């Protein structure tokens, strides 16, 4: 159980981040979710968490902004208690499709602020209370695009790979505090549609082709990702740290 | 033989970058190097290239400034010809020793702008002509801190890891034009002192512990890295792309 633990899932307002929040809630956690451009969708997830019988808080955070992150975490600490479980799920530039030389510097810059500096801000905010409490779980969200590359996705491949480096440094700083830090290296996820997964911003016939590159010949359910995350977030995962764990249904193997 | 090739070594003003530029020249390349804080050191490096009887050009570039980068590449093209070989060797935050919670946003943001946006801006400027000339070599400089972490180095480990992701995407986009893109994953390097390596910014007690955790029980000579970089830059390395090649004397093994 994650009973008596408080979770912050950045990008909790919808997609996979929402299923992360509900999964952490179902397993006993009280959960905060962020919203940026969807603070209303965040509040609605918080009400789904409350309907499960847990405490919840929707806060409005652009994770690139250290003032909004710090204010948000301090708000969680007052209302729920210090963050025990951090999920850096918020991402920009998930489905860009532009060669590097046609990629706009301001798109690159935003992707790096959200995907890297977002994780840096949130980790900096929560880790002092995790150390003080001698317990912590930080889960960073990477992609096989980060470990295998992706044509037309220079910022996403850079930021998702960068998060593995960040994971390993933070695993080192946190180790002697029972703070683990791990990266989930995601394949592709389905669910009901765009509300559940950014995969649906990819043209259906390109998705069918990516699915045929998975050994399981199907995109993952959001739950198949959230359940790995929930195990890593448990006390029982105390000797797993600094790993890049692939949740990709064989997308990263030599599939025919 | 790199005869009839134009190389750009970012941070060729000193350290390993200087030896990179010098080694590529010895191998026959016309070599542009950058300076930012040390344009005079960069002009000095260009003159050492000329002593080898090659063409050179110091250019004053902050690789984070795309304007500065675009002009610099424009300037190289006119004087030397289109860049065939890009070495993204310029780095900020190389020897931070600050836990993440005590690390300042401004130091983080600068490290990211230089180590990631630098590589982006330079690749952005040179790749159109590499594609036009149907040939190209991009060498990104990573670090075992990127693949194994390092306490108090959140920006360095983040950026050095991110350069491997960037390598793989550029390898996929460049492959059909005989443009390879590869990362060198460095251990630690000695040489003459602070002149040849930013290893010497690390306190001597810490350097001895790091050295004893290399299987070869010694830092690398800068040349031992530059020679791997030179081979990847050759026509013969044409089937090697998107790899993270470790040059680190067993620092990444269970020593
Ligand atoms: N779906 C997949 O198959 C897949 C595959 C590989 C990796 N991933 C990773 O999984 C994570 C979630 O992807 P997804 O499909 O759920 O994406 P999504 O449906 O597009 O949701 C993106 C989420 O990020 C939030 N967000 C974006 N920019 C933000 C910012 N600056 N500050 C704070 N929150 C911000 C959004 O909140 P608002 O809407 O309120 O702005 C939203 O909750 C990402 O890290 C992604 O890289 C997804
Ligand atoms: N030395 C090692 O043992 C070691 C270990 C692992 C990795 N590395 C990697 O090897 C590379 C070179 O290291 P080094 O020892 O030569 O470092 P160094 O001695 O500190 O040299 C740093 C270089 O970066 C340049 N630079 C910094 N910021 C710049 C910017 N914004 N725009 C343009 N140029 C900029 C400097 O130019 P100015 O002097 O003109 O300001 C200088 O030439 C780096 O990528 C580093 O991460 C080195």
Q: What span, in angstroms and rounded, lies between the C-alpha atoms of A207 and A201? A: 9
Instruction: Tell the residue number behind the tokens 């992707």, with chain if given.
Output: A111
**In angstroms, what CA-CA distances link B38 with B54, B162, B219, B227?**
22, 27, 25, 25
Angle between helices A118-133 and B105-112 (to 10 degrees): 140
Burial of A48 (C-beta count, 10 Å sphere; 0-12/13-18/19+) = middle
How many A from CA of A214 to the centre of ligand 1? 22
State the best of A130, A158, A159 to mutate against chain B, taking most chain B CBs within 10 Å: A158
Strands B56-60 and B179-186 come out as unpaired
Residue A85: what are its φ and ψ, rounded to 5°? -120, 110
Give the C-alpha distances (Å, rounded to integers) separating B101 from A88, A112, A129, B97, B110.
Answer: 16, 19, 11, 12, 17
Domain that holds residue A19: 1-256
Q: For residue A35, is it left (φ>0), alpha (ψ between -120 and 50) or beta?
A: beta
Pairwise CA distance, residues B14 & A168, whole Å: 30
3-state secondary structure of A146: helix
Chain A contact set for B66 (CB, 8 A): 105
* Cα A171 from Cα A202, distance rounded (Å): 34
Rounded to the nearest angstrom, the gap between the alpha carbon of residue B21 and the centroid of all alpha carbons in its chain is 10
Rg (CA), chain B: 17
Sign of the dihedral defined by the CA atoms of residues A189, A191, A192, A197, in that order: negative
DSSP SS3 for A188: coil
> Measured between beta carbons, which residues in chain B are less than 8 angstroms from residue A105?
66, 117, 120-121, 124
Residue in chain A closest to B181 (alpha carbons) equals: A149
Residue among B96, B251, B139 at smallest CA distance from B187: B251
Which chain B residue shows the shortest CA-CA distance from A148? B168
Catalytic site residue A156?
A: yes
- Closest residue of chain B to A116, computed from CA coordinates: B158
Cα B29 from Cα B58, distance rounded (Å) = 15
Distance (Å, rounded) from C-alpha B76 to C-alpha A42?
Answer: 51
Element (H, E) at A182: strand A179-186
| Residues ≥6 apart with Cβ < 8 Å to A156 | A91, A93, A94, A96, A111, A115, A143, A145, A146, A150
Give the C-alpha separation, B220 to B215, whole Å: 12
**Way the structure was solved:** X-ray
Is A157 within 8 Å of B166 when comparing Cβ atoms? Answer: yes
Q: Decide if B58 contacts B31 (C-beta within 8 A).
A: no
Task: State the distance from the centre of ligand 2 to the C-alpha of A46, rounded, in angstroms.
Answer: 47
List the structure tokens of A247.
């949740």
SS3 A155: helix
How many CB atoms sit inside 10 A of residue B237's CB?
A: 17
Q: Backbone phi, then psi, for B238, in 5-degree steps?
A: -80, -20
Cα–Cα distances in Å, from A226 out to A39, A139, A221, B83, B134? 22, 11, 9, 46, 45
Backbone angles phi, psi at B63, to 5 degrees: -55, -20
Structure-token pair, residue A133: 């409490």
**Short-list B167, B180, B223, CA closest to B84:** B180
Buried b (16+ CB within 10 A) or exposed e, B103-118: beeeebbebbbbbbbb
Give the single-character DSSP code of A202: S
Q: Give the span between the Cα atoms of B90 and B111, in whole angstroms.
A: 10
In the block, tokens 């000797």 appear at: A239
**Residue closest by Cα to atom 9 of ligand 1:** A141
- Contact at 8 Å (CB) between A9 and A233? no
Distance from C-alpha of A230 to C-alpha of A5, rounded to nearest angstrom: 12
Q: In this structure, how many other beta carbons lie within 10 angstroms of the beta carbon of residue A134? A: 10
Of B121, B161, B169, the CB nearest to A150: B169
Residue written as token pair 């031992």: B224
Burial (CB count <10 Å: 0-12, 13-18, 19+), residue B73: buried
Question: What number does the ligand 2 atom closest to the CA of B160 have?
Answer: 47
Residue B80: its H or E element: helix B66-80
Q: Which two structure tokens, joined as six digits, stand for A58?
A: 């929707």
CA distances (Å), origin A157, targets A243, B97, B229: 18, 27, 23
DSSP assignment of A12-36 equals TTSHHHHHHHHHHHHTT-EEEEEES
Q: Report CB contact under 8 Å: A116, B162.
A: yes
Nearest to A33 by CA among A51, A11, A63: A11
User: How far is residue A230's CA from residue B103's CA, in Å, rounded to a whole number?
Assistant: 29
Coil, strand or helix at A66:
helix
Helix (H) or strand (E) holding A112: helix A105-112
Nearest ligand, CA B219: 2
Enumerate residues 6+ apart whose C-beta is below 8 A from B172: A149, A150, A151, B242
Query: Which bound ligand lies closest to the C-alpha atom of A200?
Result: 1
User: How many domains does chain B fold into?
Assistant: 1
In this complex, the residue of A152, A162, A172 whose CB is nearest that of residue B149 is A172
User: β-pairing, A136-143 with A30-35?
Assistant: unpaired
Q: By the 8 A CB rule, do B184 and B89 touch?
A: no
DSSP state letter for B4: T
Ligand 2 residue neighbourhood (C-beta within 6 Å): B 10-11, 13-17, 34-38, 61-64, 89-92, 94, 114, 141, 143, 186, 188-189, 197-199
Distance CA B99, CA B120 (A): 27
The terminus-to-terminus CA distance of chain B in angstroms comes to 36
Residue A34 Cα distances to A31, A98, A136, A182, A191, angstroms: 10, 29, 19, 21, 21
d(CA B140, CA A100): 15
Two tokens, residue A14: 């919808």
How close B85 gets to chain A, by Cα (Å)? 16
* DSSP conformation class of A220: B
């Amino acid at each position: 159980s994650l009973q008596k633990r408080v979770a912050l899932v950045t990008g909790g307002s919808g997609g996979l981040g929402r299923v992360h929040a509900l999964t952490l809630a179902q397993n006993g956690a009280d959960v905060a979710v962020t919203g940026n451009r969807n603070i209303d969708k965040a509040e609605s997830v918080a009400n789904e968490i409350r309907a499960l019988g847990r405490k919840a808080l929707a806060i409005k955070v652009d994770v690139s902004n250290e003032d909004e992150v710090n204010e948000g975490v301090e708000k969680i600490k007052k209302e729920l208690g210090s963050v025990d479980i951090l999920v850096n799920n918020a991402a920009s530039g998930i489905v860009r499709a532009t060669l590097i030389e046609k990629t706009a510097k301001e798109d690159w810059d935003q992707d790096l602020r959200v995907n890297l500096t977002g994780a840096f801000n949130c980790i900096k905010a929560v880790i002092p209370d995790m150390k003080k409490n001698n317990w912590g779980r930080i889960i960073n969200i990477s992609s096989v695009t980060g470990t295998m590359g992706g044509s037309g996705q220079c910022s996403y491949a850079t930021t998702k790979a960068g998060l593995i480096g960040l994971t390993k440094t933070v695993a080192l700083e946190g180790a002697r505090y029972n703070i683990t830090c791990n990266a989930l290296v995601l394949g592709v996820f389905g669910g009901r549609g765009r509300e559940d997964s950014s995969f649906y911003d990819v043209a259906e016939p390109f998705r069918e082709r990516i699915i045929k590159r998975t050994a399981m010949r199907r995109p993952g359910d959001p739950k198949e990702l959230s359940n790995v995350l929930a195990f890593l977030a448990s006390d029982e995962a105390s000797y797993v740290t600094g790993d890049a764990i692939v949740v990709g249904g064989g997308i990263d193997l030599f599939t025919f």
